[PDB]
Amino acid sequence: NQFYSVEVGDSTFTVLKRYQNLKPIGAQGIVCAAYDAVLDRNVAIKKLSRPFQNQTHAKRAYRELVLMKCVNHKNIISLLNVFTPQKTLEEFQDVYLVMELMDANLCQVIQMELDHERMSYLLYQMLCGIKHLHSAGIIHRDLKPSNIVVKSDCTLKILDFGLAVTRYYRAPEVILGMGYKENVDIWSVGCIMGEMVRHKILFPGRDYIDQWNKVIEQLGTPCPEFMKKLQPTVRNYVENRPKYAGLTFPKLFPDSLFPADSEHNKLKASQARDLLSKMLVIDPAKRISVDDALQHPYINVWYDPAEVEAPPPDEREHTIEEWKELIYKEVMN
Numbered sequence: 001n002q003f004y005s006v007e008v009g010d011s012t013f014t015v016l017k018r019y020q021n022l023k024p025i026g027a028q029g030i031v032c033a034a035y036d037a038v039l040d041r042n043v044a045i046k047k048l049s050r051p052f053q054n055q056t057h058a059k060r061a062y063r064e065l066v067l068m069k070c071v072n073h074k075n076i077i078s079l080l081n082v083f084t085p086q087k088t089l090e091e092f093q094d095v096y097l098v099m100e101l102m103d104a105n106l107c108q109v110i111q112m113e114l115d116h117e118r119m120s121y122l123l124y125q126m127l128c129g130i131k132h133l134h135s136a137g138i139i140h141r142d143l144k145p146s147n148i149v150v151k152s153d154c155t156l157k158i159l160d161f162g163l164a165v166t167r168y169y170r171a172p173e174v175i176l177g178m179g180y181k182e183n184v185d186i187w188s189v190g191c192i193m194g195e196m197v198r199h200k201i202l203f204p205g206r207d208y209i210d211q212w213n214k215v216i217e218q219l220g221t222p223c224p225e226f227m228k229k230l231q232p233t234v235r236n237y238v239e240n241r242p243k244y245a246g247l248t249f250p251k252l253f254p255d256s257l258f259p260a261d262s263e264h265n266k267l268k269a270s271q272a273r274d275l276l277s278k279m280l281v282i283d284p285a286k287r288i289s290v291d292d293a294l295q296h297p298y299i300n301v302w303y304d305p306a307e308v309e310a311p312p313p314d315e316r317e318h319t320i321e322e323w324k325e326l327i328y329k330e331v332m333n
C-alpha cells in the first residue's frame with residue numbers, strides 16, 4: 001500500500017509514502033509541513049475533508065482545484081500534487097493539496113516593525129500576482145493577509161482565487177452589491193498596506209453594518225455620483241448613516257507610523273501615504289488601477305519589465321453527490 005497515517009494534533013494525515021515526517025504548521029482545511037523524497041523539497045499538505053458537503057464550499061474547492069493548476073505565476077501558490085487515500089467514489093472522503101512550503105503568512109509579517117524596502121516589495125508582489133490573475137480573467141475580490149504566505153527572503157504568494165466571516169478587506173462595491181472592475185482588488189491591497197502601517201485592522205466591523213461605518217468614518221461619505229450608482233434600497237441604508245467628512249490621509253496615517261528618520265524615509269512615507277490615498281478610495285471610478293500602482297514611486301523600484309509585461313494565459317450549481325463525483329473526477333486527474 002502506497003499510503004500511511006500520521007497523527008498531527010486533532011488530525012490524522014493519511015498521505016502517500018513519499019511525504020515524510022509530517023509536522024504541524026488557515027485555510028479552508030488542515031495543514032502540515034512535510035518532506036518530499038520524490039522532489040527532495042519540503043512541502044505543505046492541506047487536508048480537505050468532505051469538501052462536497054457544503055454547497056458553497058464544494059464550488060470553491062472545485063474552483064481552487066482547476067484554477068490552481070490552470071494558473072502558473074511566481075506570486076500565486078501552485079498545486080504540486082493532489083491525491084485521495086480513498087479508492088472508490090462511494091468511500092471517497094479526503095482531498096490532500098500539496099504546495100511548496102513557505103515560512104510564514106502575512107498576518108505574521110504585518111506584526112514586524114517593517115521598513116519601506118520590505119514593505120513595498122511585498123506590495124509589489126501582491127499587485128504583480130493580482131495583475132496576473134486579472135489577465136487570466138480571475139478577479140479575486142477576497143484578498144486578505146491570512147491567504148497570503150511569504151518566504152524568509154520575502155518572496156510572496158497569494159493562496160487562493162477568491163469569489164465567484166472576515167469582511168474587513170472587501171471592497172465597498174462588493175459589500176454593497178455594485179458591479180466591479182479590476183481595481184476592486186486594489187481596495188484590499190490598501191487595507192493591507194494600511195495595516196502594515198498601523199499594525200491594526202483598518203475597518204474591523206463587528207458585522208456588515210459596522211463595517212461600512214468603520215469605513216465612511218475614516219474616509220467620509222461618498223459623493224452623490226457614487227450614491228447614484230447604488231440600487232434604490234441600498235442607497236437608503238447607506239445614506240441614512242451619519243454624514244462624515246472623513247480624515248486627511250496624513251491624519252489616518254500620521255508620520256508617527258512611518259520611519260521618517262531622514263530624507264529617504266520622509267519622502268518614502270509621503271509616497272506611501274499617496275498610494276494609500278489612491279488605493280483606499282470608496283468609488284471604483286476614482287480608485288487607482290493595478291498598473292499605475294505598480295508604477296507608483298513607492299513601488300516602481302521593484303518593477304521588472306519582463307516579470308510583469310509577459311505572455312497572458314463556467315459556474316453552475318450542483319447536488320452534494322454531483323459535487324462529490326465532480327471533485328473526485330478532478331483529483332483523478
Ligand SMILES: O=C(NCc1ccccc1)c1cc(-c2n[nH]cc2-c2cccc(Cl)c2)c[nH]1
Nearest residue numbers: 025026027031033044099100101102103104105
Ligand atoms: O508558518 C509557515 N511555515 C513555517 C513552518 C512552521 C512549522 C513547521 C515548518 C515550517 C507556513 C507555511 C505556509 C504554507 N506554505 N505553503 C502553503 C502553505 C499553506 C498553509 C495553510 C493553508 C494554505 Cl492554502 C497554504 C503557511 N504558513
